[PDB]
C-alpha cells in the first residue's frame, strides 16, 4: 500500500506530491517488536538443535563432553556447530571446509586461558583444538534459573478473561553456540587474513570490528552475541588499575 502527501503554498494553486510506500514503515515496526527478535534468536537456536538431532546428537551436550573415551562425538559436534555458524554467515555453502582435523585437550598444561576452541595450520591441513575440561566446566556450572531479568497488565486482563528440553539444556546449547561463534570469528580472520593476523587477534580482539564490518556487516545476518549489550559489573572501578592520560585519535572501537 502507498500513501500520498500534498503540499500547497499560499502563492498559487501549485501542489507538489510525494508517494510513500508503507512496506518500509511496516518493516521498521516489525523490527521494533521484541517478540520478533526473540523469535529470530529462538528460531536460530531451534535450527541448531534440529541440526544436532538429525546427526543423532540428541544426548545432552554436557553428557557428550563428559565422555572422555568417545572423541568422535565431540569432534562431530564442534564441526557441526562451526558449519552451522558458517552457513549463518554465508547462506550458500552447506558443507564446511572439506578437510580438517581435531585434537582434544584434557590438560591445563596445554590449555589456552579464554579460547577453548583454537585453530592452527600443521603445514598440511587445518587443525582444531578442543579444550574438553573447559567446555565441561562451562556446561556443568549451575545456572540462575529462578531469577527474573528486567507485561503485568496483559496478564491481569487474561486472568480476568516431544523431546524434553529443559531450560538448562537450552542454556547449554546457547553457551556452546556462542563459544563456537567466537571461535569462528577467530577462524574467519585466520582464513581470510593469514596466520599473522590470527595470532594478532588472539591477543587483541579489537581487530574484529575492522576485519568484520568491511564484509560481514553488509552481507550476512546479525551475530548471536549482538542480541544483548553485555557489560562487566563495576568495570570502571576494576579497570582503574590501568588508566591512561590518553589522546585517542584512532578510536576505531567506541
Amino acid at each position: 500500500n502507498k500513501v500520498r502527501t500534498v503540499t500547497e503554498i499560499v502563492n498559487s494553486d501549485e501542489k507538489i506530491q510525494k508517494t510513500y510506500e508503507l512496506a518500509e514503515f511496516d518493516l521498521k515496526n516489525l523490527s521494533s517488536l521484541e517478540s520478533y527478535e526473540t523469535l529470530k534468536i529462538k528460531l536460530a537456536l531451534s535450527k541448531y538443535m534440529a541440526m544436532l538431532s538429525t546427526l543423532e546428537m540428541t544426548q545432552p551436550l554436557l553428557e557428550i563432553f563428559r565422555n572422555k573415551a568417545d572423541t568422535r562425538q565431540i569432534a562431530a559436534v564442534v564441526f557441526s556447530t562451526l558449519a552451522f555458524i558458517h552457513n549463518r554467515f554465508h547462506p550458500l555453502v552447506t558443507n564446511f571446509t572439506n578437510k580438517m582435523e581435531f585434537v582434544v585437550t584434557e590438560t591445563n598444561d596445554t590449555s589456552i586461558p579464554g579460547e577453548p576452541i583454537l585453530f592452527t595450520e600443521n603445514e598440511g591441513v587445518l587443525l582444531c583444538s578442543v579444550d574438553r575440561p573447559s567446555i565441561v566446566k562451562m556446561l556443568s556450572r549451575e545456572f540462575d534459573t529462578e531469577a527474573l531479568v528486567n507485561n503485568c497488565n496483559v496478564r491481569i486482563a487474561k486472568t480476568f478473561g516431544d523431546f524434553s528440553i529443559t531450560e538448562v539444556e537450552a542454556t547449554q546449547y546457547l553457551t556452546l553456540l556462542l563459544t563456537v561463534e567466537h571461535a569462528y570469528l577467530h577462524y574467519y580472520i585466520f582464513k581470510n587474513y593469514g596466520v599473522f593476523e590470527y595470532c594478532k587477534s588472539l591477543t587483541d580482539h579489537s581487530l574484529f570490528t575492522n576485519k568484520l564490518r568491511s564484509t560481514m556487516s553488509t552481507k550476512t545476518s546479525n551475530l548471536l552475541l549482538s542480541k544483548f549489550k553485555f557489560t562487566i559489573e563495576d568495570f570502571d572501578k576494576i579497570n582503574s588499575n590501568s588508566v591512561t592520560s590518553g589522546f585517542n585519535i584512532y578510536n576505531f572501537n567506541k
Binding site: 498559487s12 507538489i16 521494533s32 517488536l33 521484541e34 517478540s35 531479568v149 496483559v154 553485555f230
Partner: protein, 218 residues
C-alpha cells in the same frame, strides 16, 4: 582444638566495645565472624548471641526476658568490657550489629545485560497511552538548567546582512523548500510511530495543518 579461644575473645571484646560505646576505628568482616564465634562458643554468652543473631532478618524474635535474665545479660556484657551500662547500651549495640550484619560483602563481577533497542511489545498502543508512559519515563530524567545572558529577545536589524541573505536565498523556490520540510517532518513522525508500535491517526496529522484555511477564510 579447633578454636583459638583467647584471640577470638579479645577480638570480640574490641568489636563489642567499639559498637556498644564508641558509636563514632575500623574493623574487618573477619572480626565480626570472630565475635559471633566467641559468643556462640562461650556458654554464658548464649543469650547475647541469640539477641544479636535476631538481627539477621525481620522475622525473628526473642521471648520476654525476666528480671534475673536481664541482670545475667548485663553482668555478662560488663565482664566483656567495669564501666556502668544498662539495657539502653544493649539496644544501641544491637542496632549497630543489625546495621553491620546487613552490610554487603565482596562479590565477583558478573556480566550485566542491557537492552540494545527499546523493543515494544506486540499489542499496539494509542498516542495517549504512549504519551503517559513516555512522560512517566521523562519524569525520571535529570533536567538541566539553562541561563540566558539577558531577557531580551534575540534579533538582528543589520540591513546589509538581511538583504544579502535574502538575495542568496532568492533563487530558492518556496514550494520546494516547504515541501521538503513538511515531508521530512512527516517521514520522521511516521518512522517514530512505526518504531514505537503506535497507531498513526491520519486525521489528526491533517488537522495539524488546517491553519492554512483558517487564515484564508477569516
Amino acid at each position: 582444638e579447633l578454636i583459638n579461644m583467647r584471640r577470638y575473645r579479645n577480638a570480640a571484646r574490641k568489636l563489642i566495645h567499639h559498637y556498644s560505646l564508641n558509636s563514632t576505628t575500623e574493623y574487618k568482616i573477619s572480626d565480626v565472624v570472630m565475635t559471633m564465634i566467641f559468643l556462640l562458643r562461650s556458654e554464658k554468652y548464649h543469650s547475647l548471641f541469640k539477641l544479636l543473631e535476631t538481627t539477621f532478618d525481620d522475622y525473628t524474635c526473642r521471648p520476654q526476658m525476666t528480671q534475673v535474665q536481664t541482670d545475667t545479660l548485663l553482668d555478662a556484657v560488663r565482664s566483656l568490657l567495669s564501666t556502668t551500662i544498662d539495657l539502653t547500651t544493649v539496644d544501641i549495640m544491637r542496632s549497630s550489629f543489625a546495621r553491620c550484619f546487613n552490610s554487603p560483602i565482596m562479590r565477583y563481577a558478573k556480566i550485566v545485560l542491557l537492552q540494545n533497542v527499546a523493543l515494544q511489545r506486540d499489542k499496539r498502543t494509542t498516542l495517549e497511552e504512549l504519551l503517559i508512559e513516555r512522560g512517566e519515563k521523562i519524569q525520571m530524567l535529570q533536567p538541566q538548567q539553562y541561563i540566558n545572558s539577558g531577557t531580551e529577545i534575540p534579533f538582528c536589524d543589520d540591513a546589509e546582512f538581511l538583504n544579502r541573505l535574502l538575495k542568496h536565498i532568492d533563487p530558492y523556490p518556496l514550494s520546494r523548500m516547504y515541501y521538503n520540510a513538511a515531508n521530512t517532518m512527516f517521514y520522521t513522525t511516521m518512522e517514530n510511530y512505526a518504531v514505537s508500535n503506535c497507531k498513526f491517526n491520519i486525521e489528526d496529522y491533517n488537522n495539524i495543518f488546517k491553519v492554512m484555511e483558517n487564515i484564508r477564510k477569516h
